Design a protein around this ligand. Structure first.
Ligand SMILES: COC(=O)[C@@H](NC(=O)[C@@H](NC(=O)CC[C@H](O)[C@H](Cc1ccccc1)NC(=O)[C@H](C)NC(=O)[C@H](C)N)C(C)C)C(C)C
Lengths: 99, 99
């Protein structure tokens, strides 16, 4: 599909059985989603945003269906305002920027 | 042009006589650039990112050339890690997301 930026780019995702909406973010090197009930072993890690650094929990090799497109990656869960689809995933569903 | 997300999406901009590189960010409602020597009257304002809120200085009706494309908008200057091209500008050079 084709997406114009008049409105924030939101999408429907399916992660470990729960249906959420995420934001397609080209300025995000990483995939970071809110606190969700995720099972597996994780690791402490830090990431930065305009306002600073939140400690996240780093889960790898998670299955996520983006706009009905299946991908597999590292996802980090933390105290984020909005869920974000970063470049580590957008490359996978082969997302391009155009102008 | 066509842009794949293997590498952060960077671009060359020209703002009030100085040549900088900015990041094309679809998850950014707003254009926020580092401290630059900008002239005109401004206003205090707050914005939020994953890590919080920085007070910015809000300048409106600024001329900015994006990848050799001229646009006019509100730009906010602040203590940001990287310059960002938000949606208020990407709509103007008619940028779309594609998948
Ligand atoms: C209003 O609600 C909001 O969400 C407010 N905030 C926003 O819209 C903000 N957007 C946002 O907060 C959306 C996320 C931005 O794209 C940042 C940009 C960034 C890239 C590289 C280094 C540092 C920062 N990405 C990130 O923070 C991503 C997750 N991670 C990184 O950049 C890491 C450190 N590599 C802007 C301040 C950029 C506001 C504009 C309304």
């Amino acid at each position: 599909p084709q997406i114009t930026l008049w409105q924030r780019p939101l999408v429907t995702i399916k992660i470990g059985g729960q249906l959420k909406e995420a934001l397609l973010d080209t300025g995000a090197d990483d995939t970071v989603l809110e606190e969700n009930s995720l099972p597996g072993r994780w690791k402490p890690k830090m990431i930065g945003g305009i306002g600073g650094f939140i400690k996240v929990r780093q889960y790898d090799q998670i299955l996520i269906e983006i706009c009905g497109h299946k991908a597999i990656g590292t996802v980090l869960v933390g105290p984020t305002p909005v869920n974000i689809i970063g470049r580590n995933l957008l490359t996978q569903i082969g997302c391009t920027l155009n102008f």
